[PDB]
Amino acid sequence: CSRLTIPFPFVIFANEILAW
Amino acid sequence: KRGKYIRLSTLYDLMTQHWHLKTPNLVISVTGGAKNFALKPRMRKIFSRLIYIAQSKGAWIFTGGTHYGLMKYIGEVVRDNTISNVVAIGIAPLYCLDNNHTHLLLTTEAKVRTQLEKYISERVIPESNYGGKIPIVCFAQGGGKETLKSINVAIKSKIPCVVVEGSGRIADVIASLVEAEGTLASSCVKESLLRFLPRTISRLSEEETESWIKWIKEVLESPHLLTVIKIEEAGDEIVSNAISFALYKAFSTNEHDRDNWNGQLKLLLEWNQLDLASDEIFTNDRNWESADLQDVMFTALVKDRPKFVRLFLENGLNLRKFLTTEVLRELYTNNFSSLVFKNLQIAKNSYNDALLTFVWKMVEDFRRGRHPLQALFIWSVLQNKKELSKVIWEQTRGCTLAALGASKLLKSMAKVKNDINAAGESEELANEYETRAVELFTECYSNDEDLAEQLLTYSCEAWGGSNCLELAVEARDQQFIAQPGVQNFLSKQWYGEISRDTKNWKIIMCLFFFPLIGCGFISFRFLYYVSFFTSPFVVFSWNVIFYIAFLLLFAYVLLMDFQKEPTALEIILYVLVFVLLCDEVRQWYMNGSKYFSDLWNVMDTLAIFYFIAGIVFRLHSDESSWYSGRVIFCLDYIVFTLRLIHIFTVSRNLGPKIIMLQRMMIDVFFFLFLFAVWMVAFGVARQGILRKNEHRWEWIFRSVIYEPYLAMFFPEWITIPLVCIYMLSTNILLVNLLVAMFGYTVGNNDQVWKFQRFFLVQEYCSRLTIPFPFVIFANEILAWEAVMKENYLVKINTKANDSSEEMVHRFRQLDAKLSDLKGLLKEISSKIK
Amino acid sequence: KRGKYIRLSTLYDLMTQHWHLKTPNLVISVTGGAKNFALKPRMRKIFSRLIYIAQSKGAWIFTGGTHYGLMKYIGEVVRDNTIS
Amino acid sequence: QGGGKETLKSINVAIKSKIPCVVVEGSGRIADVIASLVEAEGTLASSCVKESLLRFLPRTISRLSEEETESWIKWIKEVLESPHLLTVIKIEEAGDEIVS
Numbered sequence A: 001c002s003r004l005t006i007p008f009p010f011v012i013f014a015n016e017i018l019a020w
Numbered sequence B: 001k002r003g004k005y006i007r008l009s010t011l012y013d014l015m016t017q018h019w020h021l022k023t024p025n026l027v028i029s030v031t032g033g034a035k036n037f038a039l040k041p042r043m044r045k046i047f048s049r050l051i052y053i054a055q056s057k058g059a060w061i062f063t064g065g066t067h068y069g070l071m072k073y074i075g076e077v078v079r080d081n082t083i084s085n086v087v088a089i090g091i092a093p094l095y096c097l098d099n100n101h102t103h104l105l106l107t108t109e110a111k112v113r114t115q116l117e118k119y120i121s122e123r124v125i126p127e128s129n130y131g132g133k134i135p136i137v138c139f140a141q142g143g144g145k146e147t148l149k150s151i152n153v154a155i156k157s158k159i160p161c162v163v164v165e166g167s168g169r170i171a172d173v174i175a176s177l178v179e180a181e182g183t184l185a186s187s188c189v190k191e192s193l194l195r196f197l198p199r200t201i202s203r204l205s206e207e208e209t210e211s212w213i214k215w216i217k218e219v220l221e222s223p224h225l226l227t228v229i230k231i232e233e234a235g236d237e238i239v240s241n242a243i244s245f246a247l248y249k250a251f252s253t254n255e256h257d258r259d260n261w262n263g264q265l266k267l268l269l270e271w272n273q274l275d276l277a278s279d280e281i282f283t284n285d286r287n288w289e290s291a292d293l294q295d296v297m298f299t300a301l302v303k304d305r306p307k308f309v310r311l312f313l314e315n316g317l318n319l320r321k322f323l324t325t326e327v328l329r330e331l332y333t334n335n336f337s338s339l340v341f342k343n344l345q346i347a348k349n350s351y352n353d354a355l356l357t358f359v360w361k362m363v364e365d366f367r368r369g370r371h372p373l374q375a376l377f378i379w380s381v382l383q384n385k386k387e388l389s390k391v392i393w394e395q396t397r398g399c400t401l402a403a404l405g406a407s408k409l410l411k412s413m414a415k416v417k418n419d420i421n422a423a424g425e426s427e428e429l430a431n432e433y434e435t436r437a438v439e440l441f442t443e444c445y446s447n448d449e450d451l452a453e454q455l456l457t458y459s460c461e462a463w464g465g466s467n468c469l470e471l472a473v474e475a476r477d478q479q480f481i482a483q484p485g486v487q488n489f490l491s492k493q494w495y496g497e498i499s500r501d502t503k504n505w506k507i508i509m510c511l512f513f514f515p516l517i518g519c520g521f522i523s524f525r526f527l528y529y530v531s532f533f534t535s536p537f538v539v540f541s542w543n544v545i546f547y548i549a550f551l552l553l554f555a556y557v558l559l560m561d562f563q564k565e566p567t568a569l570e571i572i573l574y575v576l577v578f579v580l581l582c583d584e585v586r587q588w589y590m591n592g593s594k595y596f597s598d599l600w601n602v603m604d605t606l607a608i609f610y611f612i613a614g615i616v617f618r619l620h621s622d623e624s625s626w627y628s629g630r631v632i633f634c635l636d637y638i639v640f641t642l643r644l645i646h647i648f649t650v651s652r653n654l655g656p657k658i659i660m661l662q663r664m665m666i667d668v669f670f671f672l673f674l675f676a677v678w679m680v681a682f683g684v685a686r687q688g689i690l691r692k693n694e695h696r697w698e699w700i701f702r703s704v705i706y707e708p709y710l711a712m713f714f715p716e717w718i719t720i721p722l723v724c725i726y727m728l729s730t731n732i733l734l735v736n737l738l739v740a741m742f743g744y745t746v747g748n749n750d751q752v753w754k755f756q757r758f759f760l761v762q763e764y765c766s767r768l769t770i771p772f773p774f775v776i777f778a779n780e781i782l783a784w785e786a787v788m789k790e791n792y793l794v795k796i797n798t799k800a801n802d803s804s805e806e807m808v809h810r811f812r813q814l815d816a817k818l819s820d821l822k823g824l825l826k827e828i829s830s831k832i833k
Numbered sequence C: 001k002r003g004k005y006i007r008l009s010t011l012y013d014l015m016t017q018h019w020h021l022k023t024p025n026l027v028i029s030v031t032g033g034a035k036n037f038a039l040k041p042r043m044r045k046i047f048s049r050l051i052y053i054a055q056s057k058g059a060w061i062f063t064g065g066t067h068y069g070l071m072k073y074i075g076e077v078v079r080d081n082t083i084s
Numbered sequence D: 001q002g003g004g005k006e007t008l009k010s011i012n013v014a015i016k017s018k019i020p021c022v023v024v025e026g027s028g029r030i031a032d033v034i035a036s037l038v039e040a041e042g043t044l045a046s047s048c049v050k051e052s053l054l055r056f057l058p059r060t061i062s063r064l065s066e067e068e069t070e071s072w073i074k075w076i077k078e079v080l081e082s083p084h085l086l087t088v089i090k091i092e093e094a095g096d097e098i099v100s
């Protein structure tokens, strides 16, 4: 999941919770 | 952001009409501006359960809205509950204001606070739970003059009950001056209050210190308005055990509700006061007819009081009469949570079974418009009512069946990944309905086996449309099926009307010699042949014996026969293959296009369709396709023998090894698939390197697949990385081989194969009970387990022995005995004076 | 199916000679027509062990034969022991 | 096991007339009374029937006359004339085989 989120042929195209 | 403030020196309408809602409860916390307040782990817990109670009942919490000690802790628990409604109204060298109260109304302030809360106690309410009257409670935990007159002006002026506890300065005083009758104890206020808070008396005059004795002694003029949260109450639900007992005291001592037993019940039902409602209401000196216990029952179901549903049933309430046609539809759309019903949509669509379709349609026809007890049970199972559904289960008629249908309905609603908290709870509740149906059925099987096995196959009167066995295989309830009652049932369904005590070989030798059945050789249970040859152990033994003789005759046809004409041997080879196909088409039902997904049952059909093509090539009369009809018979002879090898493989390892096998079968099929992928890529590499560079046809695409198997059955610098291919292709294929070996291990093991041994034998018993050559020729027990359930519920209830050895009754039964000795010591001193 | 009834305002021979057997034990449960009866888990157990004892010793259990509270519970444990 | 006038004279006409033994237990209205008036010798306890029976069932006394309420004291005290015909299934007997 830390790779690119786009398929192979298209690689060339590219404090409120601490209170909880 | 919010927080409203009003400067102040008639009031109530400016906050219930302009601002917010009505009060079913109202709590008063009085400490005053104590800048210090020792919050223990206990006092942090008492005033955190209290705001959860005000969150549940919807109360107002009047306190002094300044940012010190308790009142800044009460404020910061309120914003903790609005993070995870509560209306904490605040009324107040110099104190700073508290930035956590919802509405602020700022010594000089404790008269408008009293005359407000004395007005809310004055009101008359048409909802009328507490006789109307809006329940007012006043807490107390600390010392000082201000919290002493707050208890005074509560109790003396009107009747709000007051709750204190034994941790503090003067709330410990009144916690000590209530277990004592000394004719108002005219100077024990001085004999208390000095030895437990010695520094406050030497700070003021005597005439006001005696006024504190006048203050305290008029609190104790009514001890029915004074509940004490004692220190030894080391458990949850002790604030509400004190608030409800304070509200029950003030309600029942009105001297008006002697005829109103029902108003005491609805009060004691809203709070979960079971052990108070049993001994103060249902004691048979009070007169109730068990006819007005029905609207109180419908409230005990919807607010999830499971202990009160049980108390209403055991005091006399016919649940069959109560569950009318409209109560179930005031329950499936009015009191059905939409998060479950949205989750019922996803379970019905993504993991669809025959039981869910009856459940999804019976939820719908109540929300759109007869076994009523089993509709209330599904209502309380779908919503994961953990302990209410255990009460309705004991009132159902088919109790082993409904414990399995609930265990399947939850196991399908726990297959939804929409919320893994609700899917983790309902899987846990399903695992204790399967356990509930194991130990009920072993109780039924420790009685006579002919009635418990009458109950396994009960026609259910359309519960879900299935018996207890069908509802346990589809649920994959491995614990219900691995129990010895169900395994003994199947081994009698497989041995048939033959007894299991005859021998194993004694059955087989009666196949080869029919007149041994008519003697006393076999000990089954006038024409015993139709009983012997219908048991599926004999049908399986004859079908394998026929299948070997079919293969020994197909070997004679292939070698000695088969010259040019299909003579009398080969025609009956069709007829023996035809009954191997006629039974397949009559078993081609119930497939769902998934019966053929195992490579040993699609192999059965593809061995005949590759054999029927051998009868096509047989009747062509030319030598160019007669021999092509022999090589398709000889290749099909190996397919028919591998099915015999697979029959011997399964039927020997049908036991503990049936999990190791058939997991290793799909693990070797994956290795052989990866080996076939590698042999294809070895074929392209070997064809691309060798000759015939551009001289090709569809010769290539049919040879490259087979040239490495014919290979199985210039060195400048590339020869050394050719070995690094054989050190990589050996590695990645040997790992797939060893994964196939040891993959059965990784992944209670007795109930895994006992479910599979049950599922395979019941799959074979669901075939025809006639051998291969003859396929062309073709509420009295629910009353019994109601007795068996009550014997079972006695077993699990009297298993509270390690909780009876917890001596919390014996820690307090001598406290009444030592106080029996205590009071007699005191009165004998009064006589000799 | 069964269940015999006699309207009544010397008696014993008309049930040991015409009807059934002799008594090694004889239990008397007296509550009267209490229309309400709080059956706890304990009182459900005391009056279920008792009928098992009368099953073992072969007793007669005289009670008020009306369908209310204990006497309808005593009756329905009796048919539970004739089922098991 | 329960209360009322009828189960009180049933214990009476059992014990007084002939000798069948009587078994009570401590869960009920007046069977809890005689479960409390057997661990006590007070020379027949001439008014402890009033010192019992009121603090543990307070609504049945204010439904009838006094001369029959004193007759209930006459009813209860002739039960206790023979305490060898009065077994109590006590509450702490949390186990099987306590009826027999």
Ligand SMILES: CC(C)CCC[C@@H](C)[C@H]1CC[C@H]2[C@@H]3CC=C4C[C@@H](OC(=O)CCC(=O)O)CC[C@]4(C)[C@H]3CC[C@]12C
Pocket (backbone or CB within 6 Å): B491, B494, B508, B540, B541, B544, B545, B548, B651, B652, B654, B761
């Ligand atoms: C030359 C041929 C004709 C003579 C040899 C006969 C055998 C090939 C046949 C007759 C006895 C048969 C067996 C009879 C008993 C067994 C065990 C039986 O397994 C069980 O009993 C499991 C118990 C259960 O499933 O509940 C399954 C069939 C099987 C292997 C049969 C497989 C084939 C057998 C060995």
Ligand SMILES: Cc1cccc(COc2ccccc2C(=O)N(CCCN)Cc2cccs2)c1
Pocket (backbone or CB within 6 Å): B540, B543, B544, B547, B580, B584, B601, B604, B605, B607, B639, B640, B643, B646, B647, B650, B760, B763, B764
């Ligand atoms: C090539 C071919 C095609 C169709 C049918 C056959 C004859 O197959 C049998 C022979 C003897 C006994 C039982 C069978 C037989 O039907 N089984 C094998 C039983 C053991 N796994 C099919 C199955 C039953 C349950 C799951 S699978 C052969």
Ligand SMILES: CCCCCCCCCCC
Pocket (backbone or CB within 6 Å): B504, B505, B508, B509, B512
């Ligand atoms: C379970 C043992 C069965 C032994 C086989 C019986 C004899 C088969 C051959 C009979 C001709």
Ligand SMILES: CCCCCCCCCCC
Pocket (backbone or CB within 6 Å): B726, B727, B730, B734, B737
């Ligand atoms: C380049 C070949 C190296 C030898 C391979 C040995 C594999 C043995 C597999 C036995 C399971």
Ligand code: NA
Pocket (backbone or CB within 6 Å): B729, B730, B733
């Ligand atoms: Na290789």
Ligand code: NA
Pocket (backbone or CB within 6 Å): B730, B733, B734
């Ligand atoms: Na290899």
